[PDB]
Amino acid sequence: ELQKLQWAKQTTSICCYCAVGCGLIVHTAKDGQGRAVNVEGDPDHPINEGSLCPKGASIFQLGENDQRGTQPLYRAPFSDTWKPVTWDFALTEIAKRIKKTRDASFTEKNAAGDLVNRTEAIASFGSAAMDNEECWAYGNILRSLGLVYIEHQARIXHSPTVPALAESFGRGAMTNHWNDLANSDCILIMGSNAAENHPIAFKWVLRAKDKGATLIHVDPRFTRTSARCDVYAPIRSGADIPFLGGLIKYILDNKLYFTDYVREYTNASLIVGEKFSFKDGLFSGYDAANKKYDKSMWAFELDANGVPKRDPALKHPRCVINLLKKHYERYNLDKVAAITGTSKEQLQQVYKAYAATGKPDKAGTIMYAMGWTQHSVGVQNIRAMAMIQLLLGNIGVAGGGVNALRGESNVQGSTDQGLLAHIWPGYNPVPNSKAATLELYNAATPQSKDPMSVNWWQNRPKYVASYLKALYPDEEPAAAYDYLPRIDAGRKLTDYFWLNIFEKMDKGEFKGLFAWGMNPACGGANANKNRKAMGKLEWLVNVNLFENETSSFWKGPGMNPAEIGTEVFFLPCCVSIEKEGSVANSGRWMQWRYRGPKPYAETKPDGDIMLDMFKKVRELYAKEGGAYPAPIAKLNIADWEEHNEFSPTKVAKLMNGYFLKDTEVGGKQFKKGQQVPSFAFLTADGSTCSGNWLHAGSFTDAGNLMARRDKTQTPEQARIGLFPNWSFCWPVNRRILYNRASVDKTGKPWNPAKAVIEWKDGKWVGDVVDGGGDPGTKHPFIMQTHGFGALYGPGREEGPFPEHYEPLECPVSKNPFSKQLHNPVAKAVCDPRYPFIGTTYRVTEHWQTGLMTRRCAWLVEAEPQIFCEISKELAKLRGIGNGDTVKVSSLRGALEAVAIVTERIRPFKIEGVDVHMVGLPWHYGWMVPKNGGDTANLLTPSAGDPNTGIPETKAFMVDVRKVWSHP
Partner 1 sequence: GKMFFVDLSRCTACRGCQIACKQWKNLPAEETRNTGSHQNPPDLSYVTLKTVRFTEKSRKGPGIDWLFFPEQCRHCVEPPCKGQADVDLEGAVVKDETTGAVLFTELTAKVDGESVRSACPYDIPRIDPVTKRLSKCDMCNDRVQNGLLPACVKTCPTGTMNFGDEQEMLALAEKRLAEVKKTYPGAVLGDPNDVRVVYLFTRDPKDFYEHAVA
Ligand X SMILES: Nc1nc2c(c(=O)[nH]1)N[C@H]1C(S)=C(S)[C@@H](COP(=O)(O)OP(=O)(O)OC[C@H]3O[C@@H](n4cnc5c(=O)[nH]c(N)nc54)[C@H](O)[C@@H]3O)O[C@H]1N2
Which residues belong to the annotated binding site for [4Fe-4S] cluster? 15, 18, 22, 53
What amino acid is encoded at 63 in this protein? G
d(CA 892, CA 696): 47
Residues ≥6 apart with Cβ < 8 Å to 82: 73, 74, 75, 547, 570
Q: Nearer Cβ to partner 1, position 227 or 489?
A: 227
The yes or no reply on residue 931 touching partner 1 (CB under 8 A) is yes
Instruction: Return the one option of ligand [S], partner 1, W ion, none that residue 128 interacts with (CB less than 5 to 8 A, by type).
Output: ligand [S]
Among 40, 23, 127, 27, residue whose Cα is nearest residue 852: 127
The yes or no reply on residue 190 touching ligand X (CB under 6 A) is yes
The yes or no reply on residue 199 touching ligand SF4 (CB under 6 A) is yes
The yes or no reply on residue 923 touching ligand SF4 (CB under 6 A) is no
Q: Which of 356, 452, 479, 862 binds partner 1 (CB under 8 A)?
A: 862
Q: Nearer Cβ to partner 1, position 216 or 390?
A: 216
The yes or no reply on residue 132 touching partner 1 (CB under 8 A) is no
Which of these segments, 28-36, 217-225, 306-314, 958-966, binds ligand X (CB under 6 A)?
A: 217-225
The yes or no reply on residue 407 touching ligand [S] (CB under 6 A) is yes
The yes or no reply on residue 18 touching ligand SF4 (CB under 6 A) is yes
β-strands 908-910, 83-84 pairing:
unpaired
The yes or no reply on residue 124 touching W ion (CB under 5 A) is no
Instruction: Return the one option of ligand SF4, ligand [S], partner 1, none that residue 753 interacts with (CB less than 5 to 8 A, by type).
Output: none
d(CA 265, CA 263): 6
The yes or no reply on residue 448 touching ligand X (CB under 6 A) is no
Q: State the Cα torsion 680-787-303-775 to the nearest 10°.
A: -80
Q: Which of 117, 168, 179, 193 binds ligand X (CB under 6 A)?
A: 193
The yes or no reply on residue 227 touching partner 1 (CB under 8 A) is yes
x/- mask, partner 1, residues 932-961, rule CB under 8 A, reads ------------------------------
d(CA 152, CA 174): 19
The yes or no reply on residue 409 touching W ion (CB under 5 A) is no
| Least distance between ligand SF4 and beta carbon 591 (Å) | 11
Which of these segments, 15-23, 636-644, 745-753, 863-871, binds ligand SF4 (CB under 6 A)?
A: 15-23
Among 514, 574, 525, 510, residue whose Cα is nearest residue 550: 514
| Least distance between partner 1 and beta carbon 852 (Å) | 14
Helical pair 344-355 and 240-253, crossing angle rounded to 10 deg:
60
* Alpha-carbon dihedral sign for residues 208, 213, 216, 222: positive
Contact set for ligand [S], span 142-161 (CB under 6 A) = 153, 157
d(CA 703, CA 257): 45
Contact in structure between 775 and 740 (CB atoms under 8 Å): no
The yes or no reply on residue 53 touching ligand SF4 (CB under 6 A) is yes
Q: How distant, in Å, are the alpha carbons of 223, 229, 367, 371, 387 from that of 218?
A: 11, 10, 11, 10, 18
Q: Nearer Cβ to W ion, position 414 or 433?
A: 414
Contact set for partner 1, span 42-101 (CB under 8 A) = 43, 48, 50-54, 56-58, 60-61
The yes or no reply on residue 860 touching partner 1 (CB under 8 A) is yes
DSSP per-residue codes, 217-284: EE-SS--TTGGGSSEEE---TT-HHHHHHHHHHHHHHTT-S-HHHHHHHBSTTBBB-TT--EETTEET
What's the maximum distance between 2 C-alpha atoms anywhere in the chain? 86
DSSP per-residue codes, 73-122: EEE-TT-SS-EE--HHHHHHHHHHHHHHHHHHH-EEE-TT--EEEEBSSE
Give phi and psi for 182, each to the nearest 5.
-70, -15
d(CA 473, CA 428): 19
The yes or no reply on residue 401 touching partner 1 (CB under 8 A) is no
Residues ≥6 apart with Cβ < 8 Å to 590: 132, 413, 582, 583, 584, 695, 698, 706, 727, 728, 729, 730
Residues ≥6 apart with Cβ < 8 Å to 286: 292, 293, 824
Q: State the Cα torsion 547-553-559-564 to the nearest 10°.
A: -110
Contact in structure between 888 and 920 (CB atoms under 8 Å): yes
What amino acid is encoded at 803 in this protein? E
DSSP bridge partners of 567: 539
Contact set for ligand X, span 569-588 (CB under 6 A) = 573, 576
Contact set for ligand [S], span 334-363 (CB under 6 A) = none
* Alpha-carbon dihedral sign for residues 871, 876, 878, 882: positive
Q: Nearer Cβ to ligand X, position 96 or 224?
A: 224
The yes or no reply on residue 583 touching ligand [S] (CB under 6 A) is no
Contact set for W ion, span 139-198 (CB under 5 A) = 153, 157
Contact in structure between 681 and 164 (CB atoms under 8 Å): no
The yes or no reply on residue 393 touching W ion (CB under 5 A) is no
Q: Nearer Cβ to ligand [S], position 407 or 893?
A: 407
Contact in structure between 403 and 165 (CB atoms under 8 Å): no
The yes or no reply on residue 450 touching partner 1 (CB under 8 A) is no
The yes or no reply on residue 606 touching ligand [S] (CB under 6 A) is no
| Least distance between ligand SF4 and beta carbon 213 (Å) | 18
| Least distance between partner 1 and beta carbon 20 (Å) | 9
Contact in structure between 733 and 766 (CB atoms under 8 Å): no
Contact set for ligand X, span 933-962 (CB under 6 A) = 936-937, 940, 953-954
| Least distance between ligand X and beta carbon 61 (Å) | 14
x/- mask, partner 1, residues 800-839, rule CB under 8 A, reads ----------------------------------------
The yes or no reply on residue 17 touching ligand SF4 (CB under 6 A) is yes
Contact in structure between 526 and 956 (CB atoms under 8 Å): no
Contact in structure between 398 and 751 (CB atoms under 8 Å): yes
Residues near partner 1 (CB under 8 A) are 1-2, 4, 38-41, 43, 48, 50-54, 56-58, 60-61, 195-196, 199-200, 202-203, 206, 222, 224-228, 230, 232-234, 346, 843-845, 857-865, 867, 881-884, 898-904, 906, 931
Residues near ligand X (CB under 6 A) are 16, 18, 127, 129-130, 153, 156-157, 190-193, 196-197, 218-221, 223, 235, 237-238, 240, 369-372, 407-408, 516-520, 523, 543-545, 573, 576, 606, 839-842, 844, 846-849, 851-852, 922, 936-937, 940, 953-954
Residues near W ion (CB under 5 A) are 153, 157, 407
Residues near ligand SF4 (CB under 6 A) are 15, 17-18, 20-22, 48, 52-53, 55-56, 198-200
